[PDB]
Amino acid sequence: FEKNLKDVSFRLGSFNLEKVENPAEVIRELICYCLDTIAENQAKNEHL
Amino acid sequence: FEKNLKDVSFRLGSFNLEKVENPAEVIRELICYCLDTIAENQAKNEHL
Amino acid sequence: MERKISRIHLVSEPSITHFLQVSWEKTLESGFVITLTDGHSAWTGTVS
Amino acid sequence: MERKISRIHLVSEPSITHFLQVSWEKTLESGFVITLTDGHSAWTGTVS
Numbered sequence: 001f002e003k004n005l006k007d008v009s010f011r012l013g014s015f016n017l018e019k020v021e022n023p024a025e026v027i028r029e030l031i032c033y034c035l036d037t038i039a040e041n042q043a044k045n046e047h048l
Numbered sequence: 049f050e051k052n053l054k055d056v057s058f059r060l061g062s063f064n065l066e067k068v069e070n071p072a073e074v075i076r077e078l079i080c081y082c083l084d085t086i087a088e089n090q091a092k093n094e095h096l
Numbered sequence: 097m098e099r100k101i102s103r104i105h106l107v108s109e110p111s112i113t114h115f116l117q118v119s120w121e122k123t124l125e126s127g128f129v130i131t132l133t134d135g136h137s138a139w140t141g142t143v144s
Numbered sequence: 145m146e147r148k149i150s151r152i153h154l155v156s157e158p159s160i161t162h163f164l165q166v167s168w169e170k171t172l173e174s175g176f177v178i179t180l181t182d183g184h185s186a187w188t189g190t191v192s
Contacts, residue, residue, distance in 0.1 A: 018180045018189025024111040024135035026186030034082035041089030048096035065141030071133040072183025079163045
């Protein structure tokens, strides 16, 4: 990518080869983290 | 899915699944649903 | 209809699990759409 | 495991901004990883 904010017209940062072993590992991890945080949010909803 | 009781195992109903490809779009929809429900639960949290 | 964030972890494979996007008829004994996805393939389904 | 919800969008699929909570290691200003997801294979990378 390139960060495209004003006065920022350069390549922002650099990275190594960004990959994981399992195609769905990051997707399923995201889904489970979303489940955890919605559980926390609903628990605090009921408490408050 | 299964159903066992009273000293004998047995076979409950089942899903006659239908294969529809393009998991990318449906995964995007699912994760968007996750994020949106987390956001609404957090809004309820702060309002409460 | 209604999607539900529920991952029944499939013993046959971890990369795919039946997320809930149930489109329930008059009863859950009747057919409804369940979509399980992989990231490389997806599958809907209905119950007989 | 410092993961924050700042989403990414595809170059091959600019229509869909893939809703991905970015995951990097620790204190991104001392090593920052933008997480990847093309809908088909989500990738968490490494940097130096």
